[PDB]
XYZ file of N, CA and C in Angstrom:
255
model
N 58.684 77.698 116.982
C 57.699 77.067 117.856
C 58.388 76.964 119.265
N 57.495 77.241 120.251
C 57.912 77.073 121.547
C 57.734 75.675 122.160
N 58.814 74.931 122.069
C 58.815 73.515 122.519
C 58.877 73.416 124.035
N 59.050 72.146 124.476
C 59.182 71.900 125.858
C 60.263 72.733 126.519
N 60.471 72.522 127.816
C 61.596 73.249 128.577
C 61.280 74.714 128.621
N 60.095 75.194 128.204
C 59.805 76.555 128.274
C 58.510 76.732 129.180
N 58.276 78.018 129.423
C 57.039 78.481 130.278
C 56.003 79.125 129.313
N 54.810 78.371 129.167
C 53.823 78.907 128.304
C 52.721 79.651 129.031
N 52.670 80.927 128.995
C 51.497 81.724 129.617
C 50.313 81.609 128.634
N 49.789 80.581 128.627
C 48.532 80.423 127.722
C 47.226 80.669 128.286
N 46.547 81.551 127.699
C 45.104 81.953 127.973
C 44.126 80.916 127.431
N 44.101 79.875 128.160
C 43.116 78.701 127.767
C 41.796 78.888 128.284
N 40.797 79.068 127.475
C 39.430 79.080 127.931
C 38.635 77.826 127.711
N 38.290 77.169 128.859
C 37.575 75.884 128.865
C 36.191 75.971 128.353
N 36.015 75.926 127.005
C 34.715 75.878 126.350
C 34.139 74.540 126.253
N 33.176 74.313 126.841
C 32.377 73.074 126.696
C 31.364 72.907 125.681
N 31.843 72.728 124.385
C 30.847 72.645 123.276
C 29.985 73.828 123.136
N 30.495 74.919 122.723
C 29.641 76.208 122.550
C 29.732 77.029 123.822
N 29.470 76.310 124.960
C 29.448 76.892 126.204
C 30.824 77.198 126.833
N 30.962 78.273 127.547
C 32.351 78.580 128.192
C 32.153 78.662 129.733
N 32.749 77.547 130.352
C 32.806 77.520 131.896
C 33.975 78.587 132.396
N 34.005 78.265 133.788
C 35.110 79.053 134.474
C 36.200 78.093 135.014
N 35.839 76.780 135.112
C 36.811 75.827 135.583
C 37.977 75.839 134.783
N 37.828 75.305 133.451
C 38.934 75.207 132.621
C 39.259 76.609 131.946
N 38.710 77.710 132.526
C 38.859 78.964 131.780
C 40.144 79.641 132.572
N 41.322 79.528 131.874
C 42.583 80.108 132.352
C 43.050 81.133 131.367
N 43.544 82.264 131.899
C 44.026 83.291 131.147
C 45.501 83.232 130.916
N 46.211 84.378 131.168
C 47.613 84.241 131.088
C 48.152 83.462 132.256
N 48.157 82.169 131.974
C 48.493 81.166 133.110
C 50.044 80.658 132.643
N 50.975 81.218 133.528
C 52.282 80.923 133.345
C 52.512 79.396 133.621
N 52.345 78.664 132.630
C 52.534 77.153 132.610
C 53.939 76.812 132.152
N 54.405 75.715 132.721
C 55.677 75.302 132.411
C 55.568 74.049 131.475
N 55.990 74.130 130.087
C 55.882 73.011 129.222
C 57.179 72.160 129.367
N 56.914 71.094 130.064
C 58.096 70.090 130.276
C 58.285 69.805 131.667
N 57.104 70.096 132.510
C 57.069 69.741 134.081
C 56.306 68.470 134.276
N 55.548 67.956 133.269
C 54.769 66.792 133.424
C 53.697 66.963 134.423
N 53.195 68.227 134.527
C 52.119 68.587 135.555
C 50.758 68.622 134.865
N 50.788 68.882 133.496
C 49.535 69.037 132.670
C 49.260 67.739 132.003
N 48.005 67.427 131.563
C 47.632 66.157 130.961
C 48.377 66.142 129.612
N 48.347 64.903 128.963
C 49.080 64.737 127.817
C 48.239 65.206 126.627
N 48.797 66.107 125.897
C 48.101 66.669 124.720
C 47.752 68.073 124.912
N 47.587 68.566 126.158
C 47.483 69.993 126.344
C 48.692 70.821 126.210
N 49.667 70.745 127.187
C 50.870 71.573 127.248
C 51.468 71.455 125.953
N 51.511 70.292 125.355
C 52.061 69.991 124.061
C 51.370 70.787 122.889
N 50.155 70.676 122.835
C 49.396 71.416 121.778
C 49.769 72.917 121.735
N 50.304 73.398 122.894
C 50.720 74.776 122.954
C 52.087 74.966 122.574
N 52.976 73.964 122.874
C 54.405 73.887 122.571
C 54.752 73.760 121.024
N 53.727 73.228 120.332
C 53.920 72.910 118.826
C 53.785 74.252 118.087
N 53.005 75.213 118.594
C 52.908 76.507 117.876
C 53.618 77.569 118.479
N 53.842 78.721 117.769
C 54.517 79.896 118.264
C 53.798 80.569 119.469
N 54.116 81.878 119.680
C 53.432 82.675 120.696
C 52.359 83.507 120.053
N 51.485 84.017 121.037
C 50.384 84.898 120.559
C 49.394 84.220 119.551
N 49.437 82.851 119.508
C 48.605 81.984 118.626
C 47.385 81.504 119.321
N 46.249 81.606 118.657
C 45.034 81.103 118.995
C 44.831 79.598 118.874
N 45.045 78.869 119.864
C 44.970 77.397 119.701
C 43.576 76.886 120.256
N 42.542 76.989 119.479
C 41.245 76.539 119.923
C 41.090 75.133 119.659
N 41.720 74.277 120.318
C 41.826 72.871 120.176
C 40.674 72.201 121.069
N 39.966 71.329 120.517
C 38.986 70.500 121.270
C 39.567 69.266 121.938
N 40.090 69.493 123.097
C 40.830 68.511 123.905
C 39.828 67.688 124.744
N 40.247 66.530 125.149
C 39.372 65.752 126.124
C 39.932 65.905 127.555
N 39.177 65.243 128.420
C 39.580 65.442 129.902
C 39.862 64.054 130.538
N 41.118 63.731 130.772
C 41.543 62.419 131.402
C 41.222 62.209 132.890
N 41.153 61.094 133.267
C 40.938 60.756 134.712
C 41.872 61.419 135.634
N 43.124 61.446 135.112
C 44.140 62.055 136.015
C 43.747 63.487 136.540
N 42.756 64.158 135.885
C 42.351 65.288 136.475
C 41.784 65.197 137.865
N 42.042 66.211 138.776
C 41.615 66.183 140.250
C 40.099 66.241 140.270
N 39.468 66.604 139.313
C 37.969 66.523 139.204
C 37.470 65.404 138.528
N 36.485 64.670 139.264
C 35.811 63.592 138.718
C 35.173 63.802 137.384
N 34.635 64.872 137.237
C 34.053 65.252 135.910
C 34.914 65.306 134.664
N 36.126 65.923 134.915
C 37.146 65.979 133.902
C 37.997 64.797 133.763
N 37.349 63.600 134.071
C 37.894 62.474 133.918
C 37.592 61.850 132.575
N 36.462 62.214 132.036
C 35.955 61.872 130.634
C 35.137 62.965 130.084
N 35.717 64.227 130.063
C 34.992 65.314 129.406
C 35.718 65.937 128.095
N 35.130 65.642 126.947
C 35.678 66.265 125.648
C 35.332 67.834 125.688
N 36.324 68.519 126.159
C 36.200 70.017 126.164
C 36.906 70.802 125.039
N 36.426 71.959 124.772
C 37.000 72.888 123.779
C 37.931 73.872 124.443
N 39.261 73.728 124.327
C 40.251 74.532 124.840
C 40.454 75.672 123.966
N 40.238 76.889 124.390
C 40.740 78.057 123.558
C 41.941 78.592 124.311
N 43.186 77.925 123.780
C 44.435 78.311 124.391
C 45.142 79.467 123.541
N 45.291 80.494 123.990
C 46.029 81.579 123.514
C 47.420 81.604 123.861
N 48.151 80.785 122.826
C 49.561 80.601 123.095
C 50.340 81.747 123.346
N 50.521 82.124 124.601
C 51.358 83.230 124.993
C 52.466 82.576 125.873
N 53.826 82.789 125.515
C 54.800 82.072 126.209
C 55.847 82.967 126.716
N 56.196 82.715 128.004
C 57.337 83.380 128.634
C 58.402 82.406 129.011
N 59.753 82.657 128.871
C 60.797 81.781 129.136
C 61.367 82.081 130.475
């Protein structure tokens, strides 16, 4: 399992309950798990599984988000657990 302190190139598709938007739609996004830049529950959900794994977790959207909308938005994240160190 790829835990913190690693870079997770996760292709996470922001699916809003059946529908798929472009905002939360990220592909091979070289994310850093352990930078505290992503919301709580997101970066982690990817660090708990291995790589090349399809993490279609229905995560919520906290106020911390830069967008007012994703302050309280229960979204469906299709995170393709790809990870680069």
